[PDB]
């Protein structure tokens, strides 16, 4: 489609539609996009000294890019309430992507006056690379995706990338990748982009809890068949003989009972908690987290595998770095007190998965013998064992859509681990650039390359639409379920809402696991 | 048509931004607060040569002194499908009124 | 109604306009901050009612 000077490239959508198999959303926002790194690719690195964990090689680019894999970007509070309260699952399946409305505007700074001009010959080229051609930087839970609330303007990120690296000088392996080399749409004002994407077939995303947990799946009322050993010596009164004795789980003891069925897989974190008092004086922030270790280089595992942050009415602790972090409306970006950030809490998993802080289990360490005790050992790391069934980590509300699975050899269960679902194919990436504009070359003829150019930004709107398959819940449960419900109690502002300065706020992380389902 | 004012010193010089566009929409399903009938100023003069500036657009909703409560709504205006008119493009919809009875 | 005229169960609908914003100038560093320059403009035009 192509407009002239004064028709609209596109109409603004932003919507929900429940078809009650699926629903639809749509959101469109403004987006300005300037110029980086004046006009021209650069190599950067990890500065000087830094730690050898802290290195890094790749290269800045002139770039942007739009990314919404945030769930916020698609779902309002309200609409995320339909969804979370009444299904099972969900998945997306399509999605549609539509660029319109684009302006270019030119700035001239003169003395401390600065006049904004229309520049109606210029350009804006937009390509999606959708063959998977480049460094895949979505999934990283970086900043710039579109705003949550729709009135707001967003700035639109840079593209760089990374690539091998010693210390901070590079390898010959490292690749560098030029993104004037793609095809690409090019686009004056009164163009408009367009592509759509159909999502792989992907598993549910899991909105339930469980009303039963691994540990207690049998009648109570009846006896096993099977016995354990309930005793390992008789007293002869003047001293116990050992002699060892079985019996068969019942009711009276529900732990000695033969399971057909096992937790899922730990990595063992360090607990903190949100009372001050309560923690160690020590710096640990390092020395005490856990961490894996690539060559010669310890990374903190931040995210971990998807664990419950803590047991039964120990909602002041927290595993270190075992839970997703959220910060509250207006939060600096460092060295933040625990009030301004929201802490996400998985206690929903505590049924089928361990407990982060704590340990798998024990283990005998030891043959005995007569002479010789028993002894066991903790077991604090688990991979996985047949027979071992597990929950994934919750999406929330702000958290990832999806993320892609890494193209390699091999790869067990590719469910992502900060949440949402793993796609080999993910959404491609959309990267758009001001084509440059010369300014004023020389009379005389000169072989090097241009300095100089107009100084400008480009601006339009950009709409997203996401179909979604629902997974609708059908239970016998007779009592009611617990719901995700607004607190009825007077406040001076309502949650989920602007100020009176017109600030927009999210006041809580809201996970997508209230339904219950029996294991 | 879409104008940008740009204020130096004292002088504004008032020029056409011919790419700008202006959005508008109809709810037409009932789904905002109904603020036309409470006899607001702003309706169109009565006398067909007066320019009339349009209205700004508020809502109350459930108060407990000046707190709100738990049932008050927020709606959003930048959230529902609206036609985005840029110089050239016009805006049209008809109405069809339900039965009334006459005004005697 | 008590002011008069015609009570209508789905009177006509409410006609909402908008001018959309223009960003100005954003910096050349990224900022995940929302914008608070924007350049000032107004819109004007023609509006016509015919009722039968």
């Known amino acids: 489609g192509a407009d002239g000077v004064g028709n609209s490239s596109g109409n603004w959508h932003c919507d929900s539609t429940w078809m009650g198999d699926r629903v639809i959303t749509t959101s469109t926002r403004t987006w300005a996009l300037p110029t980086y790194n004046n006009h021209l690719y650069k190599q950067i690195s990890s500065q000087s ?38 299904n099972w699952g969900f998945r997306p399946k399509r999605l549609n992507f539509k660029l319109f409305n684009i302006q270019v505007k030119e700035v001239t700074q003169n003395d401390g006056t600065t006049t904004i001009a229309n520049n109606l010959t210029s350009t804006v080229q937009v390509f999606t690379d959708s063959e998977y051609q480049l460094p895949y930087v979505l999934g990283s839970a970086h900043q710039g995706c579109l705003p949550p609330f729709p009135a707001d303007v967003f700035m639109v990120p840079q593209y760089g990338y990374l690539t ?22 090019m686009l004056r004002t009164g163009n408009n982009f367009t592509f759509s994407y159909t999502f792989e077939d ?54 000695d009972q033969s399971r057909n069925w096992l937790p899922g897989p730990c990595y063992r974190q360090q607990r903190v908690s949100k009372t001050s008092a309560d923690n160690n004086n020590s710096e640990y922030s390092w020395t005490g987290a856990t961490k894996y270790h690539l060559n010669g280089r310890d990374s903190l595992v931040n995210p971990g595998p998807a664990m419950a942050s803590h047991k039964d009415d120990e909602e002041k602790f927290f595993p270190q770095s075992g839970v997703l972090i959220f910060g509250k409306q207006g939060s600096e970006k460092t060295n933040v007190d625990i009030e301004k950030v929201m802490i996400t809490d998985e206690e929903e998993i505590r049924t089928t998965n361990p407990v982060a802080t704590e340990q798998y289990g024990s283990v005998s360490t030891n043959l005995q013998r007569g002479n010789r005790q028993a002894a066991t050992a903790d077991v604090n790391t688990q991979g996985v064992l047949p027979g071992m069934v597990w929950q994934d980590r919750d999406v929330y509300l702000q958290g990832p859509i999806w993320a892609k699975i890494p193209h390699t050899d091999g790869h067990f269960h590719p469910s992502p681990l900060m949440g949402g679902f793993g796609l080999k194919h993910p959404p491609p990436q959309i990267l758009i650039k001001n084509t440059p504009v010369p300014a004023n070359p020389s009379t005389t003829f000169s072989a090097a390359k241009f300095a100089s150019f107009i100084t400008q930004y480009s601006t339009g709107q950009v709409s997203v639409e996401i179909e979604w398959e629902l997974q609708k819940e059908n239970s016998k449960r007779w009592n ?13 502002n309502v949650d989920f809402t602007v100020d009176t300065n017109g600030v927009y706020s999210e006041p809580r992380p809201i996970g997508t696991r209230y339904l219950t389902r029996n294991l």
């Open 49 to 86: 000294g830094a730690s050898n964990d802290n290195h890094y090689f790749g290269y800045s680019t002139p770039w942007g890019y739009f990314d919404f894999n945030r769930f916020h970007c698609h779902f309002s509070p309200r609409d995320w309430q339909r969804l979370i309260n009444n």
């Open 164 to 185: 091998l690296n010693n210390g901070s000088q590079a390898v010959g392996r490292s690749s560098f990748y030029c993104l004037e080399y793609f095809p690409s749409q």
């Open 202 to 255: 992907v598993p549910f995303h899991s909105s339930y809890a469980h009303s039963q947990s691994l540990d207690r799946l049998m009648n109570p009322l009846i006896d096993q068949y099977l016995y354990y050993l309930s005793r390992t010596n008789t007293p002869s009164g003047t001293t116990t003989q050992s002699r060892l004795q079985f019996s068969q789980a019942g009711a009276s003891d529900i732990r």
């Open 480 to 492: 009611p379920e617990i719901q995700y419900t607004s607190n009825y109690n007077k406040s001076v």
